[PDB]
């Protein structure tokens, strides 16, 4: 079935000792989690719960009129952002038929840092690509980096931060090797200094 296909995070309560040297953080936009599947001709979006929420065309190698082939299917882990009609790419499980489930995440993240941009107008709205696909940036988890990101400006309403272990592979379901925290939470839970501002402002 198409359900339980996305790797899920857990609240990050315990702080990994090798955090700054073995983990990377991703700032996530507000939106809906989605399994994306481009296969022979078209692209389909599934919910975390497994059912299709859309079937359209995209500039992904998988489905599309112009660009298609056998086992040329591509599978992504995305967060759909309504206000921007954009599918923010979080992870890649399979590209052009090359599976990446058994690969460590820092490889997966780097592999999309360069292969997504290589697709002509993937980042723009177009007749064959009505929905934009934009890869999310990941950063180091050193104190300085965390401060950098927490003071950065994003083209979307930030929902939270995901913490990935560089070594873990891709396995569907919740896992401790992937952490989650609202931005205004890092100070307490991660015991570090942080730049005052929108992203670090706690709710009272
Ligand atoms: C709690 N947690 C560990 C967590 N929460 C997350 C994320 C995340 O990575 N981790 N996100 C990427 C986002 N998120 C929160 O869950 C919401 C999920 O909404 P969305 O996936 O876009 O719509 P959807 O139709 O899947 O919504 P669901 O019925 O699942 O209802 C939302 C609930 O799913 C659960 N959930 C979603 N993602 C995760 C997740 O990744 N881990 C865990 N443990 N739980 C999650 C939470 O209870 C969340 O409140 C987000 O809006 C945000 O409030």
Curated annotation (Swiss-Prot):
The record marks 9, 48, 180 as: Interaction with m3G-cap structure. Its main location: nucleus. One of its GO terms (cellular component) is nucleus. It is linked to Muscular dystrophy, limb-girdle, autosomal recessive 29: An autosomal recessive form of limb girdle muscular dystrophy, a group of genetically heterogeneous muscular disorders that share proximal muscle weakness as the major attribute. Most limb girdle muscular dystrophies present with elevated creatinine kinase and myopathic electromyographic features. Disease is usually progressive to a variable degree, ranging from minor disability to complete inability to ambulate, and can involve the large proximal muscles, as well as axial and facial muscles. It is found in: Nucleus; Cytoplasm. The chain holds residues 97 to 300 of 360 of the full protein. Residues 31-33 are annotated as: Interaction with m3G-cap structure. Coiled coil: none annotated. One of its GO terms (biological process) is protein tetramerization. Changing residue 180 to A: Reduces binding to m3G-cap structure, interaction with XPO1 and snRNP import receptor activity. The keyword Nuclease does not apply. Residues 112-204 are annotated as: Necessary for binding to the m3G-cap structure. This is Snurportin-1. GO terms for molecular function: nuclear import signal receptor activity; RNA cap binding. Component of an import snRNP complex composed of KPNB1, SNUPN, SMN1 and ZNF259. Component of a nuclear export receptor complex composed of KPNB1, Ran, SNUPN and XPO1. Found in a trimeric export complex with SNUPN, Ran and XPO1. Interacts (via IBB domain) with KPNB1; the interaction is direct. Interacts with DDX20, IPO7, SMN1, SNRPB and XPO1. Interacts directly with XPO1. Its interaction with XPO1 and binding to m3G-cap U snRNPs appears to be mutually exclusive. Can form homomers. Belongs to the snurportin family. The keyword Translocase does not apply. Keywords: Acetylation, Cytoplasm, Disease variant, Limb-girdle muscular dystrophy, Nucleus, Phosphoprotein, RNA-binding, Transport. Functions as an U snRNP-specific nuclear import adapter. Involved in the trimethylguanosine (m3G)-cap-dependent nuclear import of U snRNPs. Binds specifically to the terminal m3G-cap U snRNAs.
């Amino acid at each position: 079935h198409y359900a339980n296909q996305l790797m899920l995070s857990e609240w990050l309560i315990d702080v990994p000792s090798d955090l700054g040297q073995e983990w990377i953080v991703v700032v996530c936009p507000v939106g809906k989690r989605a399994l994306i599947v481009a296969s022979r001709g078209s692209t389909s979006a599934y919910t975390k719960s497994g059912y299709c929420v859309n079937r359209f065309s995209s500039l992904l190698p998988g489905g599309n009129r112009r660009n298609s082939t056998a086992k040329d299917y591509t599978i992504l882990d995305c967060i759909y952002n309504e206000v921007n009609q954009t599918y923010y790419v979080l992870d890649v499980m399979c590209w052009r038929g090359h599976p990446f489930y058994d690969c460590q995440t820092d490889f997966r993240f780097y592999w999309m840092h360069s292969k997504l941009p290589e697709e002509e107008g993937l980042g723009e709205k177009t007749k064959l690509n009505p929905f934009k696909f934009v890869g999310l940036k990941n950063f180091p988890c050193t104190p300085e980096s965390l401060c950098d990101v927490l003071s950065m400006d994003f083209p979307f309403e930030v929902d939270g931060l995901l913490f990935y272990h560089k070594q873990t592979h891709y396995s569907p379901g919740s896992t401790p090797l992937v952490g989650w925290l609202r931005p205004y939470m890092v100070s307490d839970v991660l015991g570090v200094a942080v730049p005052a501002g929108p992203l670090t402002t706690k709710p009272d």
